[PDB]
Design a protein around this ligand. Structure first.
Ligand SMILES: COc1ccc2nc(N)sc2c1
Ligand SMILES: [Zn+2]
Ligand SMILES: [Zn+2]
Length: 85
């Protein structure tokens, strides 16, 4: 991989789930280093309007917000994660 993970500092390879901090620092992170669920990653990364912000740093989601929003979506309590911005 070209980029190192914002959290653990090890390389991000193409076969690992990874998310870019587009809110600001523009660093790539392994999904598993952030604590983001597989569910949130799937929903966040497909949603063109949403961006992710790392713990140090168009609708912005932190990990915990993305996690909480996806749980609500999947329980049928919200229409998309954008509702949680
Ligand atoms: C290792 O330091 C970080 C920096 C940013 C960050 N963002 C997260 N969601 S976990 C995390 C950990
Ligand atoms: Zn990492
Ligand atoms: Zn950041």
């Amino acid at each position: 991989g070209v980029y190192p993970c914002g959290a653990c500092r090890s390389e991000v390879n193409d076969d690992q789930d990874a998310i870019l901090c587009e809110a600001s620092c523009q660093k790539w992170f392994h999904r598993e280093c952030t604590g983001m669920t597989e569910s949130a990653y799937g929903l966040l990364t497909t949603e063109a309007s949403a961006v992710w912000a790392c713990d140090l740093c168009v609708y912005v989601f932190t990990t915990h917000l993305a996690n909480t929003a996806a749980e609500a979506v999947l329980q049928g309590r919200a229409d998309s994660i954008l509702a949680y911005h």
